[PDB]
Ligand binder design. Sequence first.
Ligand SMILES: Cc1cc2nc3c(=O)[nH]c(=O)nc-3n(C[C@H](O)[C@H](O)[C@H](O)COP(=O)(O)O)c2cc1C
Ligand SMILES: Cc1cc2nc3c(=O)[nH]c(=O)nc-3n(C[C@H](O)[C@H](O)[C@H](O)COP(=O)(O)O)c2cc1C
Ligand SMILES: Cc1cc2nc3c(=O)[nH]c(=O)nc-3n(C[C@H](O)[C@H](O)[C@H](O)COP(=O)(O)O)c2cc1C
Ligand SMILES: Cc1cc2nc3c(=O)[nH]c(=O)nc-3n(C[C@H](O)[C@H](O)[C@H](O)COP(=O)(O)O)c2cc1C
Ligand SMILES: Nc1cc(Br)cc(Br)c1O
Ligand SMILES: Nc1cc(Br)cc(Br)c1O
Ligand SMILES: Nc1cc(Br)cc(Br)c1O
Ligand SMILES: Nc1cc(Br)cc(Br)c1O
Lengths: 204, 197, 198, 198
Amino acid sequence: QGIDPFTMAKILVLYYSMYGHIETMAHAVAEGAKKVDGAEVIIKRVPETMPPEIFAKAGGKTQNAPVATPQELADYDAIIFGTPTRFGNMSGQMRTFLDQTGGLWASGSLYGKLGSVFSSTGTGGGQEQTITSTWTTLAHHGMVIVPIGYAAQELFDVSQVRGGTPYGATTIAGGDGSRQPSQEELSIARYQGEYVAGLAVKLN
Amino acid sequence: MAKILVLYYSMYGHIETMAHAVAEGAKKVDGAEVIIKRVPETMPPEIFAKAGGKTQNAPVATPQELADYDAIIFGTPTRFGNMSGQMRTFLDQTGGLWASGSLYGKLGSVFSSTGTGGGQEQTITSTWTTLAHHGMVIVPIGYAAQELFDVSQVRGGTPYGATTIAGGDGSRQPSQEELSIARYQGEYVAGLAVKLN
Amino acid sequence: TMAKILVLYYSMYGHIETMAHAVAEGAKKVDGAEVIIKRVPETMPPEIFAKAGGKTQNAPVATPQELADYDAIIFGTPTRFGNMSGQMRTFLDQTGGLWASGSLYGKLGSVFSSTGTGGGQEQTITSTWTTLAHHGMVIVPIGYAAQELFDVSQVRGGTPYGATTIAGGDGSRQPSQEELSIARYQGEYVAGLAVKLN
Amino acid sequence: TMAKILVLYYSMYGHIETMAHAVAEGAKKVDGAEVIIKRVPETMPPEIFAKAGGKTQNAPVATPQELADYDAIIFGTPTRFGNMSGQMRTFLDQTGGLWASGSLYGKLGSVFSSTGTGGGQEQTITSTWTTLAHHGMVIVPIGYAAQELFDVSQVRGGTPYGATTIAGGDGSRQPSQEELSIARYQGEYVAGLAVKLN
Ligand SMILES: Cc1cc2nc3c(=O)[nH]c(=O)nc-3n(C[C@H](O)[C@H](O)[C@H](O)COP(=O)(O)O)c2cc1C
Ligand SMILES: Cc1cc2nc3c(=O)[nH]c(=O)nc-3n(C[C@H](O)[C@H](O)[C@H](O)COP(=O)(O)O)c2cc1C
Ligand SMILES: Cc1cc2nc3c(=O)[nH]c(=O)nc-3n(C[C@H](O)[C@H](O)[C@H](O)COP(=O)(O)O)c2cc1C
Ligand SMILES: Cc1cc2nc3c(=O)[nH]c(=O)nc-3n(C[C@H](O)[C@H](O)[C@H](O)COP(=O)(O)O)c2cc1C
Ligand SMILES: Nc1cc(Br)cc(Br)c1O
Ligand SMILES: Nc1cc(Br)cc(Br)c1O
Ligand SMILES: Nc1cc(Br)cc(Br)c1O
Ligand SMILES: Nc1cc(Br)cc(Br)c1O
């Protein structure tokens, strides 16, 4: 072949988002990952599970990213998972999708690849538990779990409300969803993307 | 005098069997009214048939009715160390209950199942997180169940809640020891529900 | 008279201690609740604690054995990289005797924490819950009864898992009225539950 | 030598100690991996160590400061009610200096544990991961590469989160061939990743 000699690592940013907050974060993660020379980055969402009429009546945000299949997760060197919280877990849509990776699991297709997580909540509560409980699933697949620690200097500033934890980037949407991701939350997300992507390139 | 819901998800019947022992234990408590209900299957029916999903007798619960009980005992098989998507999808539809505080202060407790043991604890504790967001009182079982001191044989069950080991191929049935722990969990939670009423 | 509540804490620079007093004040609003505050023993040498500027504290030091004398224990700890502090862990490491005799079984347990920057405040509470579970304690989260948990206009601790406070990177931040109010609710709620169960 | 691996453990009755040697043995299979086993200092007074009958240990004692000298650290600890041991917690509580200078950032971390009767072996590993995360370490689970994890015909430790052993309530179980083999894999896997990252 010789098809694509310049790509060094492939990064999938896979997310679920209903009102677009994770969607916004996923784009910042991808922007950070694209800063690594040789990192090929693609954004994909998991399929919606609620009936289309019920997504419409709820005002769900239509999204441009392609819908991911479970099988193609095996094509990537690193997967960065984004999900809103549902009472301190990942969303049902993300859970249902990951529940379909059993074929990958049985063949060890995700073993040793890099995994990393970012989340969103309305009022903050559960933002850590959501990431940490997602790591468990990465572990069963044998993925290397990449936290972000305190490299992002924004994390030392507690003068304002802001998402972002050493476990991964987060954003706070507000109870009514009106809060948009801040520059500092987006800067943490970008760091997570670039950090993971650099690691994927180093491992290849 | 007290009402116990045993709410479960099951594909191959292992959780279903545990749920019946949990309910059996809960029925030993005078004044406890106990009912078993399942979470709705979410996968397409042709795929459940092809996968050999087990036909089950219990009626399906709706999300709104969780508020009618004094204690809810949640059963779920593990999916990579979480509750199943089916259980997650159902609990994701309890937001109305959450906003009105309808589950607040009620007793919640959890039991699980795995193929080879791994993840059985993470499944229970990560479910507890959701119970906490609803403000439910979280009931572990500790070491009241004496089977938990015996490590001479393969046996599910943890201080966090009852568990069973199905085997990689699903062929293992819940043992007498695992069912006894599940029964204990049911009886303990129900007695607590009666005392609080 | 009707229920005995222990507010058991560890504190280095006084933030948890301040939270502990608010937790106890909340529990004291329940008629019939006897509430006492105690701390776990310091583990670092006294001279090194002084050089680090540790806060001197009046509460009596608890012993492991006396935990069995209470109906509900509300545990306070600062975070150490997302767990309970070494001091608290060392203390709970001495409760195996209570574990072997089921002395804490079925009692109410509840947790509140403190961090410099928020990160880890949830993991600290939840990983403490694990220890309470091994003792068979009934775990009491607070959910969202405290309306202060809905206001994201200002930095403030408190989670559905239990009350928390944000000390700041340099520890100069004091617990806010909203953080104390969430702590007060936690105390009152747990104390109310202990009374109902007796 | 291409990478330096620290196997850092705490052990009271020798179970983690046995496991730690198998972990190191696995890591020494990787060409260029320099592997050393070290223990965290005991915290209880010697008179109480004697009455509890603690098993004396030959491995050198580690300092908090030297953790920055390694490319990968594999932490072993017995469980205490579903957390890491107080001794391990106390030791890691003194890595605050390492934290402020980012000295452990990006290094590989991995965990193995021990219990009497199984319960808590997973919570001990995952709650240890939290601390590694605050330090910005890369967290290495083992997944299901070790075939022994599919065999449920006999009592056996080991999880996708890390190797474990079951000592028995009275400590009479010694780590089995299968559990040590999982531990050997963990060491070999981590060491290979450490070499690749250098
Ligand atoms: C079922 C359900 C449970 C929720 N649980 C929480 C929660 O525990 N904590 C929280 O802050 N927000 C919670 N929310 C608020 C959602 O997290 C919020 O709308 C979401 O993060 C928005 O992200 P998105 O635009 O990417 O969908 C919940 C929402 C629903 C619908
Ligand atoms: C998507 C998927 C993920 C699974 N993850 C795990 C696991 O992490 N650990 C495990 O021991 N078994 C796992 N299994 C085995 C299941 O838990 C097992 O079939 C189940 O507990 C049977 O319970 P049931 O009869 O009620 O369905 C998994 C199965 C599926 C389909
Ligand atoms: C060893 C150590 C580890 C710490 N880890 C964290 C942390 O993970 N997250 C955080 O926000 N603060 C952390 N801090 C900040 C302390 O948690 C903070 O000073 C404490 O909550 C103050 O409470 P106190 O006055 O009751 O001691 C840590 C401090 C030390 C000494
Ligand atoms: C304070 C204390 C707490 C313990 N908690 C647990 C536990 O939660 N689960 C368990 O199986 N064993 C528990 N045990 C049994 C210990 O983990 C067990 O003896 C240990 O793993 C042996 O490892 P070692 O020889 O390396 O010390 C506990 C023992 C003590 C002293
Ligand atoms: N039996 C089984 C099946 C899947 Br898919 C994942 C795991 Br982990 C299992 O143990
Ligand atoms: N939007 C929203 C929904 C639920 Br359910 C819980 C919380 Br907290 C939220 O902020
Ligand atoms: N062996 C053992 C000792 C204590 Br103390 C607690 C537990 Br839980 C145990 O398994
Ligand atoms: N303030 C603070 C101090 C240490 Br040491 C660790 C963390 Br993480 C913190 O947030």
